[PDB]
Swiss-Prot record, chain A:
Putative HNH endonuclease component of antiviral defense system retron Ec78, composed of a non-coding RNA (ncRNA), a reverse transcriptase (RT), a probable ATPase and this protein. Expression of retron Ec78 confers protection against bacteriophage T5. At multiplicity of infection (MOI) of 0.02 cultures slow growth when infected with T5 but do not collapse, at MOI 2 cultures enter growth stasis. This is Retron Ec78 putative HNH endonuclease. GO terms for biological process: defense response to virus. InterPro entries: HNH78-like, Retron_Ec78_HNH_endo. Keywords: Antiviral defense, Endonuclease, Hydrolase, Nuclease. One of its GO terms (molecular function) is endonuclease activity. The keyword Chloroplast does not apply. It comes from Escherichia coli. The keyword Nuclease applies. Gene3D superfamilies: 1.10.30.50.
Swiss-Prot record, chain D:
This is Retron Ec78 probable ATPase. The chain holds residues 237 to 315 of 550 of the full protein. Probable ATPase component of antiviral defense system retron Ec78, composed of a non-coding RNA (ncRNA), a reverse transcriptase (RT), this protein and a putative HNH endonuclease. Expression of retron Ec78 confers protection against bacteriophage T5. At multiplicity of infection (MOI) of 0.02 cultures slow growth when infected with T5 but do not collapse, at MOI 2 cultures enter growth stasis. The lineage of its organism: Bacteria, Pseudomonadati, Pseudomonadota, Gammaproteobacteria, Enterobacterales.
Length: 211, 550, 157, 79
């Protein structure tokens, strides 16, 4: 996934304190314009467009009750809880499906870089990164197992066709490496880094474009 | 009290004039002069007004359809609310989601309409008390609630069908009184002047039945209009009735109407020859033909008279409907051999008899022919009787059909029957590729029955690829996950990025397996080759970027 | 196929499980379980009459099974092989049995997670269940000598 | 007289009183009495892990009371 720049704590959640009241008392509309500035209106778990969205807690509220009002726990979720069952990805799947998991067994997109631990292939399938062994390898397996990237059909097929829709673009832009010069050919890759952010999938196309 | 009903009739309502008609029709004229006539004229206008639009299709001013369907404790549904479209509604889902149960509930609802049209004070079908009740539910009763739309004067026609399991303290009952009222209006205006009754049909799985062709089921009734409602919600299309009706039409076209009525008068003249031959001794055939003349008098007068259109036009219209909707059959016609009367079609240029037609081209003709028969018998005041109102419940329209022929089945059906609200429950993505997004109801593949709504898919399915519809709407991979030969590109990319994009020891031999399996001209090997070139020249970019950086 | 024949053979085979027809086994079914109710080895002297009440009842129910395991098929083994074939092939059914907690002989399956009757199934799972169930029935009652009778010769259209 | 409906009614009544409240509560009570007549002296090791069936005796006493919470014939009393 993407580096999310944790910019500034909003002043809405400073007045309400955990323990005295639950999460339902706050209005839900005062945090979304703060979150969409750093997320681009995207679920940062399926790396994922928010046609419908809700607020997802990275660590669960029932297990760690004095963690919800810190603002380091709030993210966007692919889909909404109002579906009478919900989806099977991003935020809903961790709280509904999967199973037991540890707090340190998960990758957090605020400070930890997901580029060197997981790897988006050209076929839409995610693998662990090469040379990765041990606790971080177990973490890279566990995050995919709880977030269902290798998983539900509507995410996997859409990511596969989004990466496969630019394969002639990548092929014909790369085959002119000897034809073009250094600065004006790396200008193509800065053009891609200025292009890809107005899409659903960013790091998958980053892995398809460069390495 | 009378004034309020007259004000409601002036404002526009079908039901408000009905009790006025029922209270003033029983007295004498003078007190009924123009009084009964204006409510009859307004009621028949509210039934029969319609206009031809810019595309040439007759559209009624007061369309009849089903708006909402609510199932409470019915089979697997706790409390399910479905909003149905005006023209086409598609219900999709896995095997196990109750999408045949929805059609069964709507058919049980429409049975009251059919029975109350057919006979005054009639009773339709009822819910079973052994299987339709939810075996998990604790209330021990199930009700199916529907709402019907019949124009601006009639916004809502409610109906509930209730059934309780045996042993309950309170006996739950139906509230089919508005269905009773609407079918009473239709029947008592139809008994005195001809109208265009709607078509109610259900085509369930049991249309997939073999053809017998030795069918001598009861001869004489298969030309009357109310025979068109005979077992129309049973589930199987009455192809027996259609083929008997079509032999009737062939005989009447070639003999009874080309050179006037002859086959009855020739044996009438035979009786006049044999009536004075001495001892009579022919009482067995003296009277069994005498009421055949009465049959041809009191039944064919409707079909030749102004109420029901010309029989040769009926034959042309049903033949046009069959050759327009049914894919490869282009003409249908009857042969009369010595002792036999058999119908043959032109399937792909070959004259093939019906009984040896294919099972995927005969159980669709059993739908289209029977539906066209019921429209041309029930809607005879139209230039195109296929433009009449009605509700038709097809179960799995893609049954026995090739994917080539699934690309046009619902387009052909909606083209031939524009005013019919089809409610179909398909399994294939290719049928969904010809149907709008808003016409589709769907079930998620986690749907234990608790949902109070069925919603459309997120992506548009009208022009999408079949792989996209299968892999976004129906939640199925394009390439199977139970096959080790399908993940070979993923294992290729894993083993190729393990050694930084070089075909050293594993990637080369796995590339040999892909080349020996999928083939030289295979698109999978085309992706493999493109990724090989792109990832072998990526190390050149790595070296150039390293030289730039340091 | 003959799915009514399969259902009748299935309820028949379940009622014959496990006492058969030699009887013998029926005369080693009723009174054997009724020893521990009444006197339990005599005033509970030896309570279980050794641990041979388990291991399929002192291998004496197995006395009409040791030459009936694979030389012919034991009827419990026939029923279990048909059950395994149905649950292995047919999709979204993972258990099948016969109940008479009501007054009628009716078979039930475990469609998804809900225990429903065959007449309360789909029309696409019941048809495939009829095909697989009938074919597995014909293999287990035409191949008596096999360890797994589904690995037999045949041609199926 | 229909000695066709009686056979169906009889097999029906035997089926709902074989895997339900049936003629096995006497066997369970005799089993508990015979076990108690021997464990009275001692050796409760054959009672500790056989206590599940003795609790299942009271569990079979449960769900029976709803059949006899009214003045009506029990299905095993009709037979
Ligand atoms: N009487 C009933 N009680 C409970 N569940 C029922 C009943 N009848 C059907 N079902 C359930 O409904 C489903 C039957 O499938 P249905 O025919 O409704 O749909 P489809 O074949 O997918 O089309 C199964 O999940 C079954 O458990």
């Amino acid at each position: 996934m993407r580096e999310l720049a944790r910019l500034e704590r909003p002043e809405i959640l400073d007045q309400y304190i955990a323990g005295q009241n639950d999460w339902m008392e706050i209005d839900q509309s005062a945090v979304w314009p703060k979150l969409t500035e750093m997320q681009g209106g995207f679920c940062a778990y399926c790396e994922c467009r928010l046609n419908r969205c809700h607020i997802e807690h990275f660590r669960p509220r029932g297990k760690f009750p004095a963690l919800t009002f810190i603002w380091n726990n709030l993210f966007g979720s692919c889909g909404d809880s109002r579906k009478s069952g919900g989806w099977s990805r991003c935020g809903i799947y961790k709280d509904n499906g999967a199973g037991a998991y540890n707090a340190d067994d998960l990758i957090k997109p605020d400070e930890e870089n997901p580029d060197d631990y997981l790897l988006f292939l050209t076929t839409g399938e995610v693998v662990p990164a090469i040379g990765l062994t041990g606790r971080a390898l177990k973490k890279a397996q566990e995050t995919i197992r709880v977030f269902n990237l290798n998983g539900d059909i509507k995410l996997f097929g859409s990511r596969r066709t989004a990466v496969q829709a630019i394969m002639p673009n990548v092929e014909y832009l790369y085959t002119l490496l000897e034809e073009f010069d250094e600065d004006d050919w790396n200008e193509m890759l800065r053009d891609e880094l200025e292009k890809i952010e107005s899409d659903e999938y960013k790091t998958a196309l980053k892995h398809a474009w460069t390495f | 009290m009378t004034k309020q009903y007259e004000r409601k009739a002036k404002g526009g309502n079908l039901l408000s004039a009905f009790e006025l008609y029922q209270r003033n029709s029983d007295k004498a004229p003078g007190l009924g002069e123009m009084l009964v006539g204006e409510w009859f004229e307004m009621c028949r206008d509210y039934i029969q007004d319609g206009h031809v639009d810019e595309s040439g299709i007759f559209r009624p001013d007061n369309a009849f359809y089903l708006r909402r369907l609510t199932l409470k404790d019915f089979r697997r549904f706790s409390l399910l609310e479905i909003k149905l479209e005006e023209d086409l509604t598609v219900i999709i889902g896995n095997n196990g989601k109750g999408k045949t149960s929805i059609l069964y509930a709507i058919a049980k609802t429409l049975s009251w309409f059919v029975a109350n049209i057919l006979k005054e004070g009639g009773s339709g079908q009822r819910l079973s008390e052994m299987t339709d009740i939810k075996n998990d539910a604790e209330d021990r009763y199930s009700d199916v609630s529907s709402t019907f739309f019949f124009g601006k004067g009639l916004k809502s026609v409610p109906i509930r069908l209730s059934r309780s399991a045996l042993g309950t303290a309170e006996r739950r009952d139906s509230e089919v009184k508005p269905a009773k009222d609407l079918a009473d209006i239709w029947r008592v205006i139809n008994e005195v002047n001809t109208i265009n009754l709607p078509t109610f049909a259900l085509y369930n799985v049991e249309r997939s039945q073999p053809f017998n062709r030795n069918i001598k089921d009861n001869t004489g009734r298969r030309e009357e209009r109310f025979d068109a409602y005979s077992q129309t919600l049973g589930g199987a299309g009455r192809f027996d009735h259609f083929v008997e009706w079509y032999i009737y039409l062939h005989k009447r076209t070639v003999s009874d109407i080309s050179s006037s009525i002859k086959e009855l008068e020739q044996q009438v003249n035979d009786l006049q020859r044999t009536v004075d031959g001495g001892m009579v001794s022919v009482k067995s055939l003296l009277e069994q033909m005498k009421f055949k003349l009465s049959e041809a008098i009191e039944r064919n007068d409707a079909a030749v008279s102004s109420r029901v259109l010309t029989e040769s036009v009926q034959k042309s219209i049903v033949e046009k409907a069959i050759c327009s909707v049914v894919p490869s059959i282009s003409n249908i016609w009857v042969e009369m051999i010595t002792g036999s009367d058999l119908v043959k079609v032109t399937n792909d240029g070959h004259d093939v008899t019906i009984d040896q037609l294919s099972d995927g081209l005969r159980v669709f003709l059993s739908l289209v022919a029977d539906l066209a028969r019921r429209m041309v018998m029930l809607n005879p005041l139209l230039e195109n009787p296929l433009e009449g109102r009605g509700i038709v419940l097809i179960d799995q329209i893609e049954l026995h059909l090739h994917p080539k022929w699934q690309q046009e089945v619902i387009l052909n059906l909606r083209s031939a029957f524009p005013n019919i609200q089809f409610i179909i429950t398909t399994h294939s993505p290719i049928v969904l590729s010809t149907i709008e997004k808003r016409c589709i109801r769907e079930f998620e593949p986690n749907d234990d029955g608790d949902q109070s709504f069925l919603d459309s898919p997120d992506m548009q399915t009208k022009g999408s690829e079949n792989a996209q519809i299968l892999e976004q709407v129906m939640n199925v991979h394009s390439t199977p996950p139970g096959i080790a030969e399908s993940h070979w590109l993923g294992n290729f990319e894993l083993l190729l990025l393990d050694n930084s994009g070089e075909l050293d020891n594993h990637s080369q031999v796995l590339y040999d397996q892909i080349k020996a399996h999928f083939g030289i001209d295979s698109i999978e090997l085309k992706k493999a080759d493109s990724l090989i070139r792109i990832n072998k020249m990526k190390n050149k970019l790595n070296k150039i970027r390293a030289e730039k950086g340091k």
